[PDB]
Amino acid sequence: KLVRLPGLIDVHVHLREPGGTHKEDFASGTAAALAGGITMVCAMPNTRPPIIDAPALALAQKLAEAGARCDFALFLGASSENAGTLGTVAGSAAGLKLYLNETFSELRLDSVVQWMEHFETWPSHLPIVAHAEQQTVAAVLMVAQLTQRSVHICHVARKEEILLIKAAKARGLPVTCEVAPHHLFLSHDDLERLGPGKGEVRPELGSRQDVEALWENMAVIDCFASDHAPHTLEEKCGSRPPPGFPGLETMLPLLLTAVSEGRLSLDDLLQRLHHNPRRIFHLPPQEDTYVEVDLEHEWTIPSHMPFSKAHWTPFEGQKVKGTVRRVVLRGEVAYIDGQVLVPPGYGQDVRKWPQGAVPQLP
């Protein structure tokens, strides 16, 4: 007895191409997506070169069109120099990404006035998402109100953050958010096992109380998204470990386990991995596309999943129930039981589909 799900959407992945292809590339990352029951991904702009102008977007689009095995949209990244310059290409992107905390030299913003400039200049009908932790959530919400538009908050990880968003929603403010699986299924209690290198992630792992607050406030969470952030084991275990966990291959099995335990319903899962991603980002339907999962199969997450070049996982040793058996993408068998069966380049830029343009007034 398999269950047929629609094509699931992950609105937050780092696929590392161009410039970090030892960590992941479009072909490997989208293989990972398909194996995790994900048929459409939105890829973040912190590549090398970063996707912060039209020529970099053009390059990344062609690399994705040639390498992706599932469908995709590409984010643009906000920089200290590009506000007011992205108008002609904005509609071709998934949305605009603001990195409001740490960052590399190029996505780093040093003043809230730069955030305001982006909110004022980016087309008002197009998505804006933010990496915004702790008080930064309140700060970017203020900027959104000053500029009278919406904002989507990436990977909410803390009781503090989910309660702030809950209060904003109660006041009718146009804010949505997503949560990543590591903030639902890992906590401080796991840091001893992971160690300080593997355990490095942004936002950091929360307390048990943070995790419990996210579950208790599931109603406030609009989307799940992995923040798939692959780095090699050498990098994670080295002297300056970069933050991030791979997660495409583990997200759906973790969440299916939670459904099996009655922690959320199948509908709760599908709102958060299908319907809400579609509506917040105006992502189009995928014809003849579905995912077949087996809810009975019990297994233990191994030391690495088959596809991501990260070749490690922080969920090693966790027992899960639920697995992806088959994925059909636009009428072709894309994945069956550990084997990806569509080639690099099968995937398409959904923003180029007629249905994939974000509607706007003339």
DSSP class of residue 4?
A: E
* 131 annotated as belonging to a binding site for a ligand: yes
Residues 312, 23 contacting (CB under 8 angstroms): no
The answer to whether 33 contacts its own copies (rule: CB under 8 A) is no
Distance CA(295)–CA(353), nearest Å, equals 33
The answer to whether 222 contacts Zn ion (rule: CB under 5 A) is no
The answer to whether 24 contacts Zn ion (rule: CB under 5 A) is no
The answer to whether 157 contacts Zn ion (rule: CB under 5 A) is no
> Quick check: is 294 catalytic?
no
Distance CA(114)–CA(78), nearest Å, equals 9
Structure-token pair, residue 129: 């998402």
Q: How much of the chain is in helix, strand and coil states, percent to nearest 5?
A: 35, 20, 45
What backbone phi and psi angles, to 5 degrees, belong to 77? -110, 140
Q: Pick between residue 5 and residue 179 the one whose CB is nearest to its own copies.
A: 179
The answer to whether 130 contacts its own copies (rule: CB under 8 A) is no
Structure-token pair, residue 33: 């997506």
The answer to whether 146 contacts its own copies (rule: CB under 8 A) is yes
The answer to whether 320 contacts its own copies (rule: CB under 8 A) is no
DSSP class of residue 150?
A: -
Residue 226, contacted partner among Zn ion, its own copies, none, CB below 5-8 A by kind: none
What number of CA atoms fall less than 13 Å from residue 172's CA on the CB side? 1
Q: Pick between residue 169 and residue 275 the one whose CB is nearest to its own copies.
A: 169
* 243 annotated as belonging to a binding site for a ligand: yes
Q: Pick between residue 13 and residue 140 the one whose CB is nearest to its own copies.
A: 140
Q: Pick between residue 12 and residue 351 the one whose CB is nearest to Zn ion.
A: 12
In the complex, what is the shortest distance from the CB of residue 215 to its own copies, in angstroms, rounded to a whole number?
17
Beta-carbon contacts of 287 under 8 Å, excluding residues fewer than 6 positions away, are: 330, 331
In the complex, what is the shortest distance from the CB of residue 171 to its own copies, in angstroms, rounded to a whole number?
6
Q: What angle do CA 93, 97, 103 make, to 5 degrees?
A: 135
Catalytic residue among 227, 267, 288, 349: 227
List active site positions: 227
Residues near its own copies (CB under 8 A): 100, 111-113, 116, 134-143, 145-146, 159-160, 163-164, 167-168, 171
